[model samples]
Target chain A: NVPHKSSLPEGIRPGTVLRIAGLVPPNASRFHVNLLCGEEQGSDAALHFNPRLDTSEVVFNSKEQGSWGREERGPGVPFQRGQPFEVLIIASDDGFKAVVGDAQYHHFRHRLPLARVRLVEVGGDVQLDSVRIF
Target chain B: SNVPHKSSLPEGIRPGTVLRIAGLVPPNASRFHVNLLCGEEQGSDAALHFNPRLDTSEVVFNSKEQGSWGREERGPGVPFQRGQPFEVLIIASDDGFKAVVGDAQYHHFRHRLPLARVRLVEVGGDVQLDSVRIF
Candidate 1:
């Protein structure tokens, strides 16, 4: 697992989108994408998006004040091992709309203010090529 | 007459912002420069001035503030050539601006003005500007 963390230069707010392109390693068990409140090693994650091939499920949740909230699982896993994938997270009025590749999607309501998110963390069983926010 | 291409930097600029300028240098080009200034006029304060002296084969860096020009800072070598298309990427940092030219050579310039003051951009000289992208 390659863990990468970056400061969201301008932070994420309404109308902004976070785009990630990566490849899942063959035999991958899971991978996660986190939008955090700060860069502190394990800061509060405003949004935790996880895709698990082992369970064939995508999970969503939030961590606030150091505690993990409830996990909202998506219908099914849209990721395939050994294949490339694109993830787009659009900041909407009330929550984030996540699109997996082109066909699958999941929405997660914000547990914390979207303006509080300042860092992006990605890791676990994947080879990331690029992460861009605009 | 020297006709220059011009544009606006709507929200100004800040550290981590990358600005790109792409164009071509004429074979007989004598000199050219790119300026990130405060206003729409040439005399307005310039936060960053990238001037390439083809005749002298040198790249000069300078800034203008309050109607006065600072001592010119010169690069180690020239990175542009006649009759060649070039893309220059200028990245703003906390302390200074880093530039990478089409030649893939790097250049540096310490900030002489507050980066947020850069509200206008003008490209002048013997070169042609194809486009300018800022983000």
Candidate 2:
């Protein structure tokens, strides 16, 4: 993400939940939320969450060791145009649970260790309201 | 990689310009698009919106002018498939862009927005961008 990028010095653990609040522009084509391995550009991403409004799809994947893994797309994109939204990414022992707008869960089993994640980033067609962790 | 890849069209678009995009459409891909844009600002005009929509099995072409989309032109067949690598080229001509997907002709999008106006190239969606070049 070029808009919002942060370093997570503590890294992630089971029960950690990251909440990203933002508004989607009406003319949005797509946007991304990434949990990254480092703070540098092109850093390996532990999670790459992309929402493509033009395609009406939400795609999830991971990039590690310089390559991306298998993609997982949602059955549908629940985000509405020009509306306020919240994306909650929860960590568990096994993987991540992504909830957008509500408690609607999309599951992605971890492909890289949680310890590898040192940053959170948000970019493309979205305006951030807030980002929180609990 | 974190996506919605964006970059300047160094030397801008012109007749005889060749734009080559190499990428992978994941096996479970739904759709993706590449845009020849007039500006980098969100909601700016797009000279060409090249979209491959797998859900409808169609490749769509249109222009966004003054923030609104024009009537769409659709190609009859979708040469892009799931789990495939593609080298898509958009070769600008005196009249239009001759688009190619792999070895086959994809579309010939006529000049709707001026070629001289395009300053940015953008790609996004369920695809992995291996490389992009303008020559």
Candidate 3:
């Protein structure tokens, strides 16, 4: 996954859907996707999706004042190496849910204020193809 | 964690060529196969088909030429346990392909489809791939 980060002209709000499509390499180890409060180096993250293949775990957490919060763990990485992935993150009033597959999902309840979301980012050992926001 | 993974070998194979598949067998892993193929198409000639059957407790070695499979060679079992990380190394030698699992010597398959014809390495079935490197 090539490193990718960007600031959104329009912000995240209830009912917003963010989609990022990419391909993971055969030798991939880890990668992450983040929804942040700003485009700066150190900023609050409203949501984080970190998948560590070396350890066979997917991590989700929030960041406040640069310190990460309690983590939410998922078993088995929601990705297939050497294959393309289309991930959609949906923000609702209560939390954010990622539609990784038909029934595969990661739901993170609102920890930090959703109002803090101003930027979107995806990084790791993956090829980023499309980033769509609606 | 992608299984049934295959990749192109654009550089081709040599006597000293090394192919390493590093990953973990699922806790409930039943079987998986790592193959060096002569073509990228389905049902291509597999110069080396290294298959580990967790359910059957045997490692099968065989090759494919044209569209038909050759004689089946069986090894007792593999060294790595389910849910554990493993490195399967296949080293091309002057006469045959030597296989290794972890630090244990696995087996040797005599040249079948010829090294020059190997164009891809396809790994399929139950697996969590960390990397597939050809050196």
Highest DockQ: give the candidate number: 1
Misplaced by over 4 Å in model 1 are A1-134, B1-3, B103-105
> What ranking of all candidate models by TM-score puts the best one first?
1, 3, 2
lDDT of 3 at B28: 98
Alpha-carbon deviation at A40 in model 2, angstroms = 60
Scored by CA lDDT, what does every candidate get?
0.81, 0.81, 0.80
lDDT of 3 by residue, B1-135 (tens): 877788898877766555668998999999889999988887888889998988888899999997999999987566757898898768675467878776456787888777888898999888899888665
Over A28-78, each residue of candidate 1 has an lDDT whose tens digit, in order, gives: 999999998887777889999999999899999998777899999987888
Off by over 4 Å in 3: A1-134
- CAPRI category for model 1: incorrect
Supply DockQ values for each candidate: 0.07, 0.01, 0.01
TM-score of 1: 0.55
What are the per-residue Cα lDDT tens digits for candidate 1 across B1-135?
234867788887655555668888888999998898999865999999999999999999999999999999998888889998888867676577777785354777988899889898888998877777654
Off by over 4 Å in 2: A1-134
Using TM-score as the measure, the top candidate is 1
What digit string (tens of lDDT, one per residue) describes model 2 on residues A51-130? 98999999999997678888999878878789888777777656777876445458788888987888999999998888
TM-score of each: 0.55, 0.49, 0.50
lDDT of 1 at A81: 97
